[PDB]
Amino acid sequence: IAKKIHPQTIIAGWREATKAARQALLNSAVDHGSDEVKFRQDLMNIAGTTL
Amino acid sequence: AGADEERAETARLSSFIGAIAIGDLVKSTLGPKGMDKILLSSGRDASLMVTNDGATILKNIGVDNPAAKVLVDMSRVQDDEVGDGTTSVTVLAAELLREAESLIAKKIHPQTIIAGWREATKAARQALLNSAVDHGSDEVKFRQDLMNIAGTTLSSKLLTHHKDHFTKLAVEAVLRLKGSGNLEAIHVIKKLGGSLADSYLDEGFLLDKKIGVNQPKRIENAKILIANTGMDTDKIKIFGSRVRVDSTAKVAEIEHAEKEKMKEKVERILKHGINCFINRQLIYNYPEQLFGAAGVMAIEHADFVGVERLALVTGGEIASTFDHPELVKLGSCKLIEEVMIGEDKLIHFSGVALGEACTIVLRGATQQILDEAERSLHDALCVLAQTVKDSRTVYGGGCSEMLMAHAVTQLASRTPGKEAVAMESYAKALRMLPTIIADNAGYDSADLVAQLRAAHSEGKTTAGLDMKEGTIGDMSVLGITESFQVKRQVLLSAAEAAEVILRVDNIIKAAPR
Amino acid sequence: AGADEERAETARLSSFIGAIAIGDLVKSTLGPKGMDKILLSSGRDASLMVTNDGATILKNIGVDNPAAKVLVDMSRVQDDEVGDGTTSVTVLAAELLREAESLIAKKIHPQTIIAGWREATKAARQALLNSAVDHGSDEVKFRQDLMNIAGTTLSSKLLTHHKDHFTKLAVEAVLRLKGSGNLEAIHVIKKLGGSLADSYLDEGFLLDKKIGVNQPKRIENAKILIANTGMDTDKIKIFGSRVRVDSTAKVAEIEHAEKEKMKEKVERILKHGINCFINRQLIYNYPEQLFGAAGVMAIEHADFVGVERLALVTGGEIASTFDHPELVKLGSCKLIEEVMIGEDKLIHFSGVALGEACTIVLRGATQQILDEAERSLHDALCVLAQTVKDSRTVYGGGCSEMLMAHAVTQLASRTPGKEAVAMESYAKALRMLPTIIADNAGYDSADLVAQLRAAHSEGKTTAGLDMKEGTIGDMSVLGITESFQVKRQVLLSAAEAAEVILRVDNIIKAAPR
C-alpha cells in the first residue's frame, strides 16, 4: 500500500518467481549425492529432521 | 405517465452513473491478453460463473434500478450483425458521458448537441479519412484468410492453446458461404472425442439420431422424406377410449386396422426408393419393422430447426398427411450415412444440390475450453463473414484510436465553432481507449500515453499498443486486425442511443410474472 | 480513555509520529523538482512565508507537544559549518523509525538492536572511504571555478533553464570575497530587462531610494553622512510639560527654534562639501528643501541593513547627534550617483577604499519569478565559501547514496549473530533516498530504484539519478557535486539524534487536574 502505485506491476514477480523457482535448482551446489544404498550418508540425515 | 420522470440535471446523472460502473469490468477483457472473470449472486443463482465474453454476462442479469438494461440488450443486436471481434463497444459508449458535465458549461441546447451525432457520421468519414488501413482481403485470399482478427478474438479467451487453430478453420467456412447470400444454415456441434485438430469440416449437414438397433448401416442414392404429422395413430379426438368388446373375438378387427397403416407406407415408399425418413416428433413403432426389411433409415424425434434448414437445402417439399411421398417431396442424393466420428456416432447429410447451406462440426477434448468453443464460433462466424465482403480492416491494439484522436482534433477548428465545440469534445474521448488497454495488461497509464501518441502521430499506422512490451510496437507482427464494420458500428451504437436520455422515459424488464 | 499514560509500544509510537510527520513535508523539498510551502498566522506573524530551505522553516516554529524541535536544532550547526545544498539529513533520521514495526516482530529484547547505532559508525567509516571525491582547486581557477556544486544546489530549483549560467557567475563573486573577510556585504537585486547573460556584476553597492523629485541629479567627491536619529524634532519623551510662557509673544521663539535645526544642518554641512546624506528612518520636511539648493542628495527612510554594510565599505562613521559632521564622520569618496538601469532608478555607491564589500546586482528575464534570483543567489553564497575551504567534493543526485547502499547489503550477511539485523536496517535506510529523489521528479518511484541500483554496482560513481531524464544517467556530465563536509557530519548526527528517546520509554505526567 505504501508502494502507492500499481499492484499489477508487482504481478511481474510471479512470472519472475517461475524463474526464481529454478533459482532453487542449479543456483548453488549444496550436495546431491545420496546415490543409493550409501555408506555414511545412508542416514544420520532426513529421517532425523522428520523425527 | 409511468411515474419516473427526471428533468435536466438529474436525468442526465442517472445515465452517467450506469456507464462508468460497467466500463471498469469490461476493460480487462479487451485485447490479446484479457482476463477471465467470476461472478457470485444470491437468489435463483447457484454459484460463481466465469465468462470471457462480456456480452453473455450483461445479458444474464438486470441487477438494479439505474438505466443500463436497454443499452446492454442492444449489444446482442450488434452481436448478430458483426458483434464482437473483442468486446469494446460498451467502453466507447461509456466515455461520451464524461464530456456531458462540460456541456452544462456551454449552457445552451442539449438537443443541438445531438447534431453532433450527425457529425458522428462525420466521425465515420474522418476515422477512415487519413493515414492507413489494410487494403487487400480481395476474395478467398491465400494467406490473409485468417491468422488475424479471429486469432485476436480468441486471444483474450483462455482457450487460445488448441483453439487458435479452431478460429483459423472458421474462415474456411465463410469461403463456401462466399458470394452474395444469406447468413443462414450454418450448424456447429462440439463433440466428446479427443484430437489435436479439435474440429472437423463437413461438406454437409450433421444430425444425431437413429431409427433403432436394426436397419441397414448406410443408404445410397438417398431420398429424404420429412413429415409434419406424426406416424402415431389411435387417439383421434375424443378417443372412444380403450373401451372393450363382447369378448376377445372382436379385438382382432382392431389389430387389422393397424395393418392398413403399415401397408400404405411401404407400398408407395418403395416406388420412390426412399432411403431415409426424418420426422420431428414421436414415431409409431409398426413402420420400424417394415423400414428395416425395405432398407430405409428413419429418424425418431428429429429437431424442427434442423428440418427447416434441411428443406431449403434439398429443394424442400410439402409436409402434410402420408400422401406427402413421391413428387410432392424433393430429395437430394449424394449420400446419407451414420459415421463414427471418433467416439460418438453421428449421421451425416451431404452433397446438397442447392449448395446455399453448409454445416461445421467441432470436436474438442471435453472441458471448459469446449463449452467456450460455442462462445468463440458464434463470435467467429459473424466477423469472418463481414471480413470477406467488407474489403477493409484496421490495425488493432489501439492503433486506430490514437490516430483517429489526432485526426479529430484538427477538424474542430476546420468546422464552424458551435459544431466544432461538440466535435472537439468527441475527439478527446478517443484518448481514454489507449489508457484502458495499457492499464489492463499492467504498466502505468500516462507514461504509455506520452510514447503512444508520438508513434501514431509519426505516420506509422502499423504501430500500436504492445501490452507484452509495456510500451509501443508493431501491431501487424502481432496479427491483430479489426473488421471495418466493427469500427463504424460501435461508433453508431455509441451514437444514437447516447443521443437520447430525455426521450425514452422508461427503462427495465425483469422476466415473466 | 484519557490521561496521557504510555505503555511499552505506545511510547515508541510518540517518537515514531514526530519522524513521519516531518518527513512528508520535507521529502517533496529534496532535489530539482522540490516544492515550496507557504505558512501564515494571525498575530506575532504578519504574512505567509514560503521557505524553500527545510532547515529555516523548522527553526522558527514549535507547533506541538511531541518531541522533534531539539532534533531540528541540530541542522543549524551543520548549516553554519558546511551549509546546505539540498536538505536531506532530516529525512534519513525519520526513516530509521519505520523498521521499529518489524522490531516487535522480533518479540524480543529491543535494545540489543541498538548495536545498529554501533553499526551506523561502521557505515560512517565507509562513507569516508567510498565515494570518489576530487582533485583540484587551484585558486580563482580557469575552467573548474564552477559548473559544479553551485549547480547542484540550483538543480533542486526549476530556475535551472537560464539560471545555471547565473550560478557560474556566482564564483566570480566569491573570488573577491574569498578568505579572511567571512560572510558580509553581499547584496542582490533584480532588473526588469531580458538578456542571454541574465546577470551583471557591480563593483559597488546598489540602494533603491530618492530624496524627492527635486534636488541635484549627480554628486561627485561625495561625502556620506549616516544618522541614528531623525531630522524630526518636537516631543523629547518627557515633554517638559504642556508649557507656560508669558503670552503669545514668546511662543514665536518655539517656531523660531525649528529654524535653528535648519541653520546647523546647512552651515556645518556646507563646510564639509556634503554630497550625500543617508538617514535610517523618517526625515523632517524642513531640511529637505535645504539639500536641493545646496547641491546635496539625501535619502529618506534608508534601511539599516544596507547602512551597516555601507559603513564597513566607506570606513564608517560615528553616528550621533548633529555634532556628527566633520572628522567623527569618515566619508569615502569616489562616485555616488543615481543611475537609470534602463528599467528602474537606483543609486550606486562605488569606489570603496576597503574593497572587502561588493554587490552582485543581476538583471535577467522578467516575471514574478525573477524574485527567484533572491532565493537562488543566497544558495550560491553558502556553497562556494565551503567549496573553496574544503577543496573536496562528492557526486550529487544521490550518486553517493546508492553506492554506499550496495556495499552495506553485503555487510549485514557477513556479520554474525545479533548484529546483521541491526546493520541491515541501517543499510536499507539508504534505499529510500533514491526513492525520495525520484518521487518529486514525477516519474514512477519503483522503476527508478532498480535501474539506479544496477548502475552503481558497476563501479560508476559518476552515475546517478537524473530526474529531468526520468531514468538514470551520468551525474558528472551534469556537473552536479556535493561538498565533502555535508556527507560526513550528517551520518554522525542522524544516528545519534534518533538513538536517544528510543532508549527512554515514557514521557511522564504533571500535577494540575
PDB file of N, CA and C in Angstrom, chain C residues 289-362:
ATOM      1  N   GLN C 289      14.275  70.760   1.668  1.00  0.00           N
ATOM      2  CA  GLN C 289      14.368  71.899   0.760  1.00  0.00           C
ATOM      3  C   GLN C 289      15.796  72.454   0.701  1.00  0.00           C
ATOM      4  N   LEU C 290      16.430  72.493   1.867  1.00  0.00           N
ATOM      5  CA  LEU C 290      17.801  72.991   2.020  1.00  0.00           C
ATOM      6  C   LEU C 290      18.808  72.196   1.190  1.00  0.00           C
ATOM      7  N   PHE C 291      18.669  70.879   1.226  1.00  0.00           N
ATOM      8  CA  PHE C 291      19.562  69.985   0.493  1.00  0.00           C
ATOM      9  C   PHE C 291      19.541  70.231  -1.027  1.00  0.00           C
ATOM     10  N   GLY C 292      18.349  70.487  -1.572  1.00  0.00           N
ATOM     11  CA  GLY C 292      18.209  70.719  -3.012  1.00  0.00           C
ATOM     12  C   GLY C 292      18.970  71.925  -3.551  1.00  0.00           C
ATOM     13  N   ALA C 293      18.892  73.055  -2.854  1.00  0.00           N
ATOM     14  CA  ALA C 293      19.599  74.267  -3.287  1.00  0.00           C
ATOM     15  C   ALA C 293      21.119  74.138  -3.128  1.00  0.00           C
ATOM     16  N   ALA C 294      21.522  73.523  -2.021  1.00  0.00           N
ATOM     17  CA  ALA C 294      22.936  73.310  -1.687  1.00  0.00           C
ATOM     18  C   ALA C 294      23.688  72.464  -2.717  1.00  0.00           C
ATOM     19  N   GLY C 295      23.026  71.433  -3.218  1.00  0.00           N
ATOM     20  CA  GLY C 295      23.663  70.522  -4.154  1.00  0.00           C
ATOM     21  C   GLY C 295      23.945  69.182  -3.486  1.00  0.00           C
ATOM     22  N   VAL C 296      23.090  68.842  -2.523  1.00  0.00           N
ATOM     23  CA  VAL C 296      23.254  67.640  -1.701  1.00  0.00           C
ATOM     24  C   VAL C 296      22.077  66.653  -1.813  1.00  0.00           C
ATOM     25  N   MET C 297      22.385  65.388  -2.057  1.00  0.00           N
ATOM     26  CA  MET C 297      21.357  64.346  -2.168  1.00  0.00           C
ATOM     27  C   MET C 297      21.213  63.531  -0.868  1.00  0.00           C
ATOM     28  N   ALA C 298      20.010  63.562  -0.294  1.00  0.00           N
ATOM     29  CA  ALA C 298      19.702  62.843   0.954  1.00  0.00           C
ATOM     30  C   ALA C 298      18.744  61.663   0.716  1.00  0.00           C
ATOM     31  N   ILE C 299      18.752  60.672   1.586  1.00  0.00           N
ATOM     32  CA  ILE C 299      17.861  59.522   1.403  1.00  0.00           C
ATOM     33  C   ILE C 299      16.894  59.341   2.579  1.00  0.00           C
ATOM     34  N   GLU C 300      15.599  59.394   2.265  1.00  0.00           N
ATOM     35  CA  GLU C 300      14.539  59.246   3.266  1.00  0.00           C
ATOM     36  C   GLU C 300      14.241  57.771   3.560  1.00  0.00           C
ATOM     37  N   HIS C 301      14.217  57.427   4.844  1.00  0.00           N
ATOM     38  CA  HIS C 301      13.918  56.062   5.298  1.00  0.00           C
ATOM     39  C   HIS C 301      14.869  55.006   4.715  1.00  0.00           C
ATOM     40  N   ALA C 302      16.152  55.318   4.619  1.00  0.00           N
ATOM     41  CA  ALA C 302      17.095  54.327   4.122  1.00  0.00           C
ATOM     42  C   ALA C 302      17.227  53.237   5.180  1.00  0.00           C
ATOM     43  N   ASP C 303      16.954  51.985   4.832  1.00  0.00           N
ATOM     44  CA  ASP C 303      17.010  50.943   5.850  1.00  0.00           C
ATOM     45  C   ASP C 303      18.432  50.623   6.339  1.00  0.00           C
ATOM     46  N   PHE C 304      18.448  50.210   7.601  1.00  0.00           N
ATOM     47  CA  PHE C 304      19.652  49.954   8.403  1.00  0.00           C
ATOM     48  C   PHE C 304      20.574  48.850   7.872  1.00  0.00           C
ATOM     49  N   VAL C 305      19.997  47.762   7.373  1.00  0.00           N
ATOM     50  CA  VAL C 305      20.800  46.626   6.910  1.00  0.00           C
ATOM     51  C   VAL C 305      21.759  47.027   5.771  1.00  0.00           C
ATOM     52  N   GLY C 306      21.294  47.866   4.851  1.00  0.00           N
ATOM     53  CA  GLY C 306      22.164  48.360   3.796  1.00  0.00           C
ATOM     54  C   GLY C 306      23.277  49.239   4.362  1.00  0.00           C
ATOM     55  N   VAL C 307      22.889  50.053   5.345  1.00  0.00           N
ATOM     56  CA  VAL C 307      23.777  51.003   6.020  1.00  0.00           C
ATOM     57  C   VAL C 307      24.974  50.350   6.742  1.00  0.00           C
ATOM     58  N   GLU C 308      24.744  49.276   7.510  1.00  0.00           N
ATOM     59  CA  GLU C 308      25.856  48.625   8.222  1.00  0.00           C
ATOM     60  C   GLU C 308      26.922  48.093   7.274  1.00  0.00           C
ATOM     61  N   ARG C 309      26.492  47.523   6.156  1.00  0.00           N
ATOM     62  CA  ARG C 309      27.438  47.067   5.145  1.00  0.00           C
ATOM     63  C   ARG C 309      28.157  48.246   4.517  1.00  0.00           C
ATOM     64  N   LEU C 310      27.390  49.305   4.288  1.00  0.00           N
ATOM     65  CA  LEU C 310      27.896  50.529   3.680  1.00  0.00           C
ATOM     66  C   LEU C 310      28.997  51.147   4.559  1.00  0.00           C
ATOM     67  N   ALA C 311      28.787  51.126   5.879  1.00  0.00           N
ATOM     68  CA  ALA C 311      29.761  51.676   6.830  1.00  0.00           C
ATOM     69  C   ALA C 311      31.114  50.968   6.740  1.00  0.00           C
ATOM     70  N   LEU C 312      31.088  49.651   6.633  1.00  0.00           N
ATOM     71  CA  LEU C 312      32.322  48.872   6.513  1.00  0.00           C
ATOM     72  C   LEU C 312      33.057  49.326   5.230  1.00  0.00           C
ATOM     73  N   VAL C 313      32.249  49.548   4.198  1.00  0.00           N
ATOM     74  CA  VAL C 313      32.678  49.980   2.858  1.00  0.00           C
ATOM     75  C   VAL C 313      33.403  51.355   2.810  1.00  0.00           C
ATOM     76  N   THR C 314      32.836  52.354   3.480  1.00  0.00           N
ATOM     77  CA  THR C 314      33.386  53.729   3.471  1.00  0.00           C
ATOM     78  C   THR C 314      34.353  53.994   4.638  1.00  0.00           C
ATOM     79  N   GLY C 315      34.608  52.969   5.435  1.00  0.00           N
ATOM     80  CA  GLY C 315      35.442  53.127   6.622  1.00  0.00           C
ATOM     81  C   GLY C 315      34.594  53.486   7.830  1.00  0.00           C
ATOM     82  N   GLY C 316      33.339  53.782   7.556  1.00  0.00           N
ATOM     83  CA  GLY C 316      32.378  54.063   8.594  1.00  0.00           C
ATOM     84  C   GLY C 316      32.434  55.452   9.161  1.00  0.00           C
ATOM     85  N   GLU C 317      31.566  55.664  10.115  1.00  0.00           N
ATOM     86  CA  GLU C 317      31.453  56.924  10.803  1.00  0.00           C
ATOM     87  C   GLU C 317      30.747  56.737  12.134  1.00  0.00           C
ATOM     88  N   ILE C 318      30.909  57.669  13.050  1.00  0.00           N
ATOM     89  CA  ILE C 318      30.230  57.537  14.327  1.00  0.00           C
ATOM     90  C   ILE C 318      28.937  58.332  14.228  1.00  0.00           C
ATOM     91  N   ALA C 319      27.809  57.640  14.305  1.00  0.00           N
ATOM     92  CA  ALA C 319      26.515  58.295  14.148  1.00  0.00           C
ATOM     93  C   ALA C 319      25.913  58.668  15.489  1.00  0.00           C
ATOM     94  N   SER C 320      25.692  59.957  15.645  1.00  0.00           N
ATOM     95  CA  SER C 320      25.165  60.527  16.877  1.00  0.00           C
ATOM     96  C   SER C 320      24.341  61.792  16.595  1.00  0.00           C
ATOM     97  N   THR C 321      24.399  62.709  17.548  1.00  0.00           N
ATOM     98  CA  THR C 321      23.708  63.998  17.487  1.00  0.00           C
ATOM     99  C   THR C 321      24.363  64.896  16.424  1.00  0.00           C
ATOM    100  N   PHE C 322      23.621  65.911  15.956  1.00  0.00           N
ATOM    101  CA  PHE C 322      24.041  66.869  14.889  1.00  0.00           C
ATOM    102  C   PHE C 322      25.505  67.355  14.918  1.00  0.00           C
ATOM    103  N   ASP C 323      26.226  67.052  15.982  1.00  0.00           N
ATOM    104  CA  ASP C 323      27.660  67.360  16.075  1.00  0.00           C
ATOM    105  C   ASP C 323      28.401  66.443  15.082  1.00  0.00           C
ATOM    106  N   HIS C 324      27.684  65.378  14.704  1.00  0.00           N
ATOM    107  CA  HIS C 324      28.119  64.312  13.785  1.00  0.00           C
ATOM    108  C   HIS C 324      28.945  64.707  12.521  1.00  0.00           C
ATOM    109  N   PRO C 325      28.790  65.884  11.845  1.00  0.00           N
ATOM    110  CA  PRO C 325      29.630  66.235  10.664  1.00  0.00           C
ATOM    111  C   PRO C 325      31.162  66.124  10.894  1.00  0.00           C
ATOM    112  N   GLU C 326      31.932  66.723   9.976  1.00  0.00           N
ATOM    113  CA  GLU C 326      33.423  66.739  10.013  1.00  0.00           C
ATOM    114  C   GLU C 326      34.103  65.356  10.217  1.00  0.00           C
ATOM    115  N   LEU C 327      35.164  65.369  11.032  1.00  0.00           N
ATOM    116  CA  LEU C 327      36.047  64.220  11.326  1.00  0.00           C
ATOM    117  C   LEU C 327      35.376  62.992  11.958  1.00  0.00           C
ATOM    118  N   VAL C 328      34.429  63.164  12.882  1.00  0.00           N
ATOM    119  CA  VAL C 328      33.799  61.987  13.510  1.00  0.00           C
ATOM    120  C   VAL C 328      33.125  61.137  12.408  1.00  0.00           C
ATOM    121  N   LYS C 329      32.855  61.787  11.273  1.00  0.00           N
ATOM    122  CA  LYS C 329      32.330  61.128  10.073  1.00  0.00           C
ATOM    123  C   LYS C 329      33.461  60.881   9.082  1.00  0.00           C
ATOM    124  N   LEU C 330      33.590  59.663   8.597  1.00  0.00           N
ATOM    125  CA  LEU C 330      34.585  59.411   7.582  1.00  0.00           C
ATOM    126  C   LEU C 330      33.828  59.066   6.319  1.00  0.00           C
ATOM    127  N   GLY C 331      33.984  59.879   5.306  1.00  0.00           N
ATOM    128  CA  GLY C 331      33.279  59.618   4.082  1.00  0.00           C
ATOM    129  C   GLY C 331      34.210  59.280   2.961  1.00  0.00           C
ATOM    130  N   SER C 332      34.119  58.056   2.470  1.00  0.00           N
ATOM    131  CA  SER C 332      34.948  57.666   1.355  1.00  0.00           C
ATOM    132  C   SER C 332      34.442  58.415   0.145  1.00  0.00           C
ATOM    133  N   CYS C 333      35.300  58.721  -0.791  1.00  0.00           N
ATOM    134  CA  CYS C 333      34.820  59.458  -1.930  1.00  0.00           C
ATOM    135  C   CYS C 333      35.332  58.956  -3.257  1.00  0.00           C
ATOM    136  N   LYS C 334      34.398  58.553  -4.081  1.00  0.00           N
ATOM    137  CA  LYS C 334      34.700  58.196  -5.442  1.00  0.00           C
ATOM    138  C   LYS C 334      33.570  58.738  -6.312  1.00  0.00           C
ATOM    139  N   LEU C 335      32.479  57.966  -6.371  1.00  0.00           N
ATOM    140  CA  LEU C 335      31.309  58.351  -7.142  1.00  0.00           C
ATOM    141  C   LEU C 335      29.985  57.845  -6.543  1.00  0.00           C
ATOM    142  N   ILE C 336      29.090  58.762  -6.215  1.00  0.00           N
ATOM    143  CA  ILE C 336      27.742  58.405  -5.770  1.00  0.00           C
ATOM    144  C   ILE C 336      26.751  59.017  -6.729  1.00  0.00           C
ATOM    145  N   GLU C 337      25.960  58.195  -7.361  1.00  0.00           N
ATOM    146  CA  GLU C 337      25.021  58.696  -8.342  1.00  0.00           C
ATOM    147  C   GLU C 337      23.773  57.843  -8.451  1.00  0.00           C
ATOM    148  N   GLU C 338      22.717  58.424  -8.988  1.00  0.00           N
ATOM    149  CA  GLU C 338      21.514  57.661  -9.235  1.00  0.00           C
ATOM    150  C   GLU C 338      21.516  57.391 -10.733  1.00  0.00           C
ATOM    151  N   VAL C 339      21.525  56.129 -11.095  1.00  0.00           N
ATOM    152  CA  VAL C 339      21.647  55.734 -12.493  1.00  0.00           C
ATOM    153  C   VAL C 339      20.473  54.931 -12.986  1.00  0.00           C
ATOM    154  N   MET C 340      19.935  55.346 -14.117  1.00  0.00           N
ATOM    155  CA  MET C 340      18.829  54.628 -14.694  1.00  0.00           C
ATOM    156  C   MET C 340      19.401  53.299 -15.177  1.00  0.00           C
ATOM    157  N   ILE C 341      18.918  52.179 -14.684  1.00  0.00           N
ATOM    158  CA  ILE C 341      19.436  50.918 -15.190  1.00  0.00           C
ATOM    159  C   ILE C 341      18.438  50.442 -16.227  1.00  0.00           C
ATOM    160  N   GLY C 342      18.273  51.313 -17.227  1.00  0.00           N
ATOM    161  CA  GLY C 342      17.321  51.126 -18.313  1.00  0.00           C
ATOM    162  C   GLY C 342      15.860  51.036 -17.851  1.00  0.00           C
ATOM    163  N   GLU C 343      15.640  50.253 -16.816  1.00  0.00           N
ATOM    164  CA  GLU C 343      14.323  49.985 -16.254  1.00  0.00           C
ATOM    165  C   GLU C 343      13.887  50.975 -15.133  1.00  0.00           C
ATOM    166  N   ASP C 344      14.413  50.722 -13.924  1.00  0.00           N
ATOM    167  CA  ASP C 344      14.066  51.452 -12.680  1.00  0.00           C
ATOM    168  C   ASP C 344      15.267  52.205 -12.073  1.00  0.00           C
ATOM    169  N   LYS C 345      15.031  53.427 -11.569  1.00  0.00           N
ATOM    170  CA  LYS C 345      16.104  54.220 -10.943  1.00  0.00           C
ATOM    171  C   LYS C 345      16.638  53.557  -9.663  1.00  0.00           C
ATOM    172  N   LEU C 346      17.958  53.529  -9.544  1.00  0.00           N
ATOM    173  CA  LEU C 346      18.659  53.005  -8.364  1.00  0.00           C
ATOM    174  C   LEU C 346      19.877  53.889  -8.081  1.00  0.00           C
ATOM    175  N   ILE C 347      20.407  53.854  -6.867  1.00  0.00           N
ATOM    176  CA  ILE C 347      21.579  54.673  -6.557  1.00  0.00           C
ATOM    177  C   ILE C 347      22.815  53.791  -6.359  1.00  0.00           C
ATOM    178  N   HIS C 348      23.892  54.156  -7.046  1.00  0.00           N
ATOM    179  CA  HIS C 348      25.142  53.394  -6.998  1.00  0.00           C
ATOM    180  C   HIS C 348      26.187  54.005  -6.091  1.00  0.00           C
ATOM    181  N   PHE C 349      26.590  53.244  -5.095  1.00  0.00           N
ATOM    182  CA  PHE C 349      27.677  53.661  -4.240  1.00  0.00           C
ATOM    183  C   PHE C 349      28.888  52.874  -4.753  1.00  0.00           C
ATOM    184  N   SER C 350      29.981  53.530  -5.091  1.00  0.00           N
ATOM    185  CA  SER C 350      31.124  52.801  -5.659  1.00  0.00           C
ATOM    186  C   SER C 350      32.471  53.439  -5.342  1.00  0.00           C
ATOM    187  N   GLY C 351      33.542  52.706  -5.655  1.00  0.00           N
ATOM    188  CA  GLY C 351      34.887  53.204  -5.399  1.00  0.00           C
ATOM    189  C   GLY C 351      35.304  53.085  -3.950  1.00  0.00           C
ATOM    190  N   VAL C 352      34.771  52.080  -3.278  1.00  0.00           N
ATOM    191  CA  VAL C 352      35.059  51.862  -1.867  1.00  0.00           C
ATOM    192  C   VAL C 352      36.543  51.540  -1.623  1.00  0.00           C
ATOM    193  N   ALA C 353      37.121  52.269  -0.672  1.00  0.00           N
ATOM    194  CA  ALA C 353      38.529  52.116  -0.283  1.00  0.00           C
ATOM    195  C   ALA C 353      38.853  50.738   0.313  1.00  0.00           C
ATOM    196  N   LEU C 354      37.939  50.227   1.130  1.00  0.00           N
ATOM    197  CA  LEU C 354      38.111  48.931   1.811  1.00  0.00           C
ATOM    198  C   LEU C 354      38.286  47.744   0.842  1.00  0.00           C
ATOM    199  N   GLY C 355      37.390  47.654  -0.133  1.00  0.00           N
ATOM    200  CA  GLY C 355      37.416  46.584  -1.134  1.00  0.00           C
ATOM    201  C   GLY C 355      36.771  45.269  -0.669  1.00  0.00           C
ATOM    202  N   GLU C 356      36.654  45.084   0.643  1.00  0.00           N
ATOM    203  CA  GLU C 356      36.040  43.873   1.224  1.00  0.00           C
ATOM    204  C   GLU C 356      34.561  43.652   0.829  1.00  0.00           C
ATOM    205  N   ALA C 357      33.785  44.728   0.786  1.00  0.00           N
ATOM    206  CA  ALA C 357      32.342  44.641   0.500  1.00  0.00           C
ATOM    207  C   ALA C 357      31.952  44.978  -0.955  1.00  0.00           C
ATOM    208  N   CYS C 358      31.200  44.066  -1.606  1.00  0.00           N
ATOM    209  CA  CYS C 358      30.748  44.250  -3.011  1.00  0.00           C
ATOM    210  C   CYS C 358      29.283  43.775  -3.262  1.00  0.00           C
ATOM    211  N   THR C 359      28.648  44.292  -4.335  1.00  0.00           N
ATOM    212  CA  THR C 359      27.231  43.975  -4.679  1.00  0.00           C
ATOM    213  C   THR C 359      27.036  43.309  -6.080  1.00  0.00           C
ATOM    214  N   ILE C 360      26.290  42.196  -6.079  1.00  0.00           N
ATOM    215  CA  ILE C 360      26.015  41.331  -7.266  1.00  0.00           C
ATOM    216  C   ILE C 360      24.718  41.672  -8.072  1.00  0.00           C
ATOM    217  N   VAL C 361      24.351  42.943  -8.233  1.00  0.00           N
ATOM    218  CA  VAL C 361      23.077  43.294  -8.932  1.00  0.00           C
ATOM    219  C   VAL C 361      22.909  42.618 -10.323  1.00  0.00           C
ATOM    220  N   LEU C 362      21.936  41.697 -10.381  1.00  0.00           N
ATOM    221  CA  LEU C 362      21.632  40.876 -11.576  1.00  0.00           C
ATOM    222  C   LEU C 362      20.438  41.421 -12.361  1.00  0.00           C
TER     223      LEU C 362
END
